[PDB]
RNA sequence: AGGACCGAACCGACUAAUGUUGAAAAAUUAGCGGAUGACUUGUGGCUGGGGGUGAAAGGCCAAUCAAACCGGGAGAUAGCU
RNA sequence: ACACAGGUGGUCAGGUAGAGAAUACCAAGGCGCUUGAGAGAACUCGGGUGAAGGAACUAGGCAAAAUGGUGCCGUAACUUC
RNA sequence: AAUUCCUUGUCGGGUAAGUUCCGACCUGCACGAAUGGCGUAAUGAUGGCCAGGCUGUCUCCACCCGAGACUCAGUGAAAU
RNA sequence: CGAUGUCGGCUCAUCACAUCCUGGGGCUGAAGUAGGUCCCAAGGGUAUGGCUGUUCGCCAUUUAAAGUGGUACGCGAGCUGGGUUUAGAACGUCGUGAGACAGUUCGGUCCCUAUCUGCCGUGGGCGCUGGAGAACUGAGGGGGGCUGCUCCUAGUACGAGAGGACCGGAGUGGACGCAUCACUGGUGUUCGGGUUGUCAUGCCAAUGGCACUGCCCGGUAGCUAAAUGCGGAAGAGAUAAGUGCUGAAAGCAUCUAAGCACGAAACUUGCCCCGAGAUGAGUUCUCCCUGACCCUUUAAGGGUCCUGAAGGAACGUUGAAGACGACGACGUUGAUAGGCCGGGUGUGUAAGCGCAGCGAUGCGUUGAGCUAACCGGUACUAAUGAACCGUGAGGCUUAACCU
């Protein structure tokens, strides 16, 4: 349950380090992103050189949450920190070419098939 | 608050108590400020043509 | 179509083989003895009237007793009409059981919601609270304005206000049947139906899709 | 908040229609002592349904 | 709402409640019969009858466990050496509640709460 | 009721090991890697066991690619294939939620050894 | 050493909530400022109304102050109600 | 004006912890505050806890939360040193 | 600018977005030298702005503990 | 003028239509996609932040859309008090000065226990024509009515290409509502454990009190949302703008005069809820009462005796019912509550004794001990015989059958 003003860590290698959510996309009045949901973000910390600079606005996709995902049998996966992969604003492909940390099957789609390649672990 | 829809230039007045004074005052400043972007097209299409 | 009168035993779940957990209410539908039948001639509309369970002979009254004797049947914990489609026909004394939902895919369960008592506008109507601080003065959960002044100078009928909540007839529509079980007198519907454990439940087939 | 007219003595009575007490309908008599009492209560002289349950 | 909730608050707080029923239990085990308000008596059942049941088995752990819920050694003595024996056969239901009438001072419903076995030579002596 | 008590224990697995909190545990899990159906292991520490007959569950913390993951399992699901205790822990508590703050040398548990 | 620092008593009164026919005609609870000094406090004394006193707010002068209170001129006067 | 949660100068100073006349628990000694009894709705008052998020609240982080001790290490601009 | 009407002046900084803040410019409506000018370490229950921490302030409320509320007994006001 | 308290914000709304989205159409300087404009349409829907006291506005990022108005520019006996509008002080400026400025700047008490109307809920009385107990019908009233994206249809129609559909079907979202507690969680001062200070139980050991539940850690039942089920519909009727068919008046023409067909989230229904005080008080089933006597002003008249039904109320044990009433269960021919037994859950290996260690402590007995509201049993305790209210065949007129 990422919402406006939530700060997330960055799973990819893109340059960014912390980012802040600033909309949850795909609806009027929409409160939360969970896993596999697109959000508009801004970059706060960013490492000295790298694809993206502090203050850049772009999309991301949420890939890990503390609240957790739920699986059809009742099972929950929680993680220990909120996290996201930075995306282009228009194509909505990844910027990063590597991915740190585990991710989930909730991504497994047409759209984010590039990520679930690059992940170390899918749970 | 008058506004020109072609350009984007706006105006105000609110010194007065009467709305009708404020309107015809702010009409004056709106005349002047559209005369002023005849000078900044005129002067920047001299020094376009006069630079080359 | 008719349906049946059962009893919210409680909830549990059914793991499928492919993985999924289905949450189910369990409904005991021990069999519904018909007492009376109604007919366009005498009553002016077509309907049955059924009973279920057991009362104890002493705790029945004489005007009840005679009604049940007329039909043939042992007394039950109440009575319940159902209307009838074109062509459907039941004689008296004719124990309908949960085999009636054999072919059926969805149902429309109906009984009494739990009893919240006197409920305020936040709980009852989802009124959003006011500020907890920044100066608020004895007005944290109260409902704010209720009108205008003077036109119209009165509060409009059906204004949402505080007062009794729950303990009221309630339907839920289009619940998937998961299992029917003739031998144990059960019926397992997906999800959650009104009322407390022990409460009585009118289960019908879905009027909609 | 306060009244704009005196309420009548009519309305004052109408309000108090419901103020009246129901009398105790009838009294159990004990089988032993023959004393009268409240149902489900001991008697003035310590009996209840036969047996003396108080030393008084 | 109090759907399915035991206990009576009795217009006190939890530490006051706790200690009242400690005293009131003790008073009943000493005298075998007390006068008290109806609702207090009804909640004194759920404290006394568990001590009597505890003292059907003597041990040391039980004595100490009783002394943690009474804080009176005269009481645990009398529980273990006079009421464990008396109610050895009896399976629960050691206390009777009889209703008197109404306390003059404040018109409260009163009620005696005696023990069930009462041969009558253990309030004075 | 005895009606529900009987619908539950026609589903309960017979064959679940005893394990208690602190035990390191490998838990194998059917995943649909495609339309194929693989097992996937999940080793870590059992921090919490709910016991409720059929509804019984247990939480398992591991550190996976420099990142803490809990995963609650519903014991009697068919998704859980098997449960298998590597190492037996010796802890006083019923719930090791204090492991969430700790990492590394702090979050070591003593072995039970008996 | 100190119109030094932290901080009880003691002096004060910045914020909030309560109270607003009050527990109280100015308080209570939780925090707050000073706390060896241009500090604080007891007992007694002096200054009196266009007068007093005022690190000055027209502040204070017995719950009253851009002129106290009590009595008198006095049934002031009232083109107003 | 009240058998009023206010005001009122001086004196005495036990134990365990503690720097302490702070604070906690107690002794000597003194009290249970002159309406009670049930219930366990809304709402108000005074408290406790809170998934994910963390000032997005708001005129304003108001209020709440947090910080808090002793000893040792270590400590920037600026400076009237 | 505790001073600037026009004015949210223009430029730079800070924010995803800054009528406030900070640095400048000077076109000072209507600063200015003991009704003092410009500076200033320390001090401030002083005004404005930013950041970390922390949080039911909020997303969006939920549950719990006490005091009233409600019922019974006794006493028994008020504005109008 | 012997007072109608002001901008904005919060809470709660409600109507209009001059429609912002969704729905139906006509023209297009409409190939397609996408637009322009007009007509019909008020069912539902109709952002979050930065700056400012702001309304307004500008900017950022969304959305199907961020509509325009009315309601004392809706709403302070509902909240706030930033702005304005008292007393303090200061700057600029005007004035010789007291002072002043629709100039700016720091600070600055927001009372009311609801009588009547109204609204939300919940009862008592009477009535409905002998009395009682159930189940209904449905006059009327209320709730609900939102929409995105992806896939197929199809890279088909259209187009030189770029690009790229209608119509129809399938799946998965957002927002809103109803239910529920099986799951994930929250709470859980009534369950267990740890631990600081101190006081006590003669002392050791073990317990208890007080310190915000002293501080903490877990947590049963209940309640609950962030949790997970369900919902908006299809269809039918009569229409709007509009499109037509036959067709005269007017030898033709013409959607119209007679006649006929289509036609939208609007209308009436369909779905959910209330509902016979619907005084027009409806229907169906069952149950109960089958006695004398006397008087007056002789009638739906008054009284004495015997009789007291069905059922009701009251009392008690109580409830996933509850402010109180009410509603539901049970009252010995009894599981209504309490206890008790067994299980379950929670905590996490009690006390005691023994062993090891100089000691704190550790091990063994031991997954021990304790365990609330839970599940299943059990008459051990309390739900007393009775008394109380309620009667005795039910008016007249007329018809239709049956004697």
Swiss-Prot record, chain A:
Lineage: Bacteria, Pseudomonadati, Pseudomonadota, Gammaproteobacteria, Enterobacterales
HAMAP family, sorted: Ribosomal_uL14
Function: Binds to 23S rRNA. Forms part of two intersubunit bridges in the 70S ribosome.
GO CC annotation: cytoplasm; cytosol; cytosolic large ribosomal subunit
RNA-binding listed as a keyword: yes
Keywords on record: Ribonucleoprotein, Ribosomal protein, RNA-binding, rRNA-binding
Protein family: Belongs to the universal ribosomal protein uL14 family.
InterPro entries from the UniProt entry: Ribosomal_uL14 (IPR000218), Ribosomal_uL14_bac-type (IPR005745), Ribosomal_uL14_CS (IPR019972), Ribosomal_uL14_sf (IPR036853)
PROSITE patterns per UniProt: RIBOSOMAL_L14
Subunit structure, as described in the record: Part of the 50S ribosomal subunit. Forms a cluster with proteins L3 and L19. Forms two bridges to the 30S subunit in the 70S ribosome, contacting the 16S rRNA. In pre-50S ribosomal subunits interacts with RsfS, which may inhibit association with the 30S subunit.
Record keyword RNA-binding present: yes
GO biological process: cytoplasmic translation
GO molecular function: large ribosomal subunit rRNA binding; structural constituent of ribosome
Descriptive protein name: Large ribosomal subunit protein uL14
From Swiss-Prot, chain C:
Residues modified as N5-methylglutamine: 150
Posttranslational modification: Methylated by PrmB.
GO MF entries: rRNA binding; structural constituent of ribosome
GO cellular component: cytoplasm; cytosol; cytosolic large ribosomal subunit
Keywords: Methylation, Ribonucleoprotein, Ribosomal protein, RNA-binding, rRNA-binding
Pfam family of the protein (one): Ribosomal_L3
Tagged with keyword rRNA-binding: yes
Superkingdom as given in the UniProt entry: Bacteria
Disulfide bonds: none
A biological-process GO annotation: ribosomal large subunit assembly
Keyword rRNA-binding: yes
UniProt modified residues of type N6-succinyllysine: 38
Matches recorded under HAMAP family: Ribosomal_uL3_B (MF_01325_B)
Subunit structure, as described in the record: Part of the 50S ribosomal subunit. Forms a cluster with proteins L14 and L19. In pull-down experiments interacts with CedA.
PANTHER family cross-referenced by the UniProt entry: 50S RIBOSOMAL PROTEIN L3 (PTHR11229), LARGE RIBOSOMAL SUBUNIT PROTEIN UL3C (PTHR11229:SF16)
Family in the record: Belongs to the universal ribosomal protein uL3 family.
Task performed by this protein: One of two assembly initiator proteins, it binds directly near the 3'-end of the 23S rRNA, where it nucleates assembly of the 50S subunit.
NCBIfam families named among the record's database cross-references: L3_bact
Protein name: Large ribosomal subunit protein uL3
Gene that this polypeptide is encoded by: rplC
From Swiss-Prot, chain D:
GO molecular function, one term: structural constituent of ribosome
Record GO cellular component, one term: cytosol
Family: Belongs to the bacterial ribosomal protein bL32 family.
One Pfam family linked to the record: Ribosomal_L32p
Name of this protein: Large ribosomal subunit protein bL32
Origin species: Escherichia coli (strain K12)
Keyword vocabulary terms for this entry: Ribonucleoprotein, Ribosomal protein
GO biological process, alphabetically ordered: cytoplasmic translation; response to radiation; response to reactive oxygen species; ribosomal large subunit assembly
UniProt xrefs under HAMAP family: Ribosomal_bL32
Domain of life: Bacteria
InterPro entries: Ribosomal_bL32, Ribosomal_bL32_bact, Ribosomal_zn-bd
Subunit annotation: Part of the 50S ribosomal subunit. Contacts L17.
Signal peptide, first to last residue: none
Region described as Disordered: 1-37
Curated annotation (Swiss-Prot), chain F:
PANTHER family: LARGE RIBOSOMAL SUBUNIT PROTEIN BL19M, RIBOSOMAL PROTEIN L19
Keywords: Ribonucleoprotein, Ribosomal protein, RNA-binding, rRNA-binding
InterPro entries xrefs: Ribosomal_bL19, Ribosomal_bL19_CS, Ribosomal_bL19_sf, Translation_prot_SH3-like_sf
Described purpose of this protein according to its UniProt entry: This protein is located at the 30S-50S ribosomal subunit interface and may play a role in the structure and function of the aminoacyl-tRNA binding site.
NCBIfam families reported in the protein's UniProt record: rplS_bact
Swiss-Prot/TrEMBL GO biological process terms: cytoplasmic translation; ribosomal large subunit assembly
Family (UniProt): Belongs to the bacterial ribosomal protein bL19 family.
Protein name as catalogued: Large ribosomal subunit protein bL19
Complex formation: Part of the 50S ribosomal subunit. Contacts L14. Forms two bridges to the 30S subunit in the 70S ribosome, contacting the 16S rRNA. In pre-50S ribosomal subunits interacts with RsfS, which may inhibit association with the 30S subunit.
UniProt-listed HAMAP family: Ribosomal_bL19
rRNA-binding keyword on record: yes
Induction pattern: Part of the rpsP-rimM-trmD-rplS operon.
Pfam families: Ribosomal_L19
Disulfide partners: none
Molecular function via GO: large ribosomal subunit rRNA binding; structural constituent of ribosome
Gene Ontology CC: one annotated term: cytosol
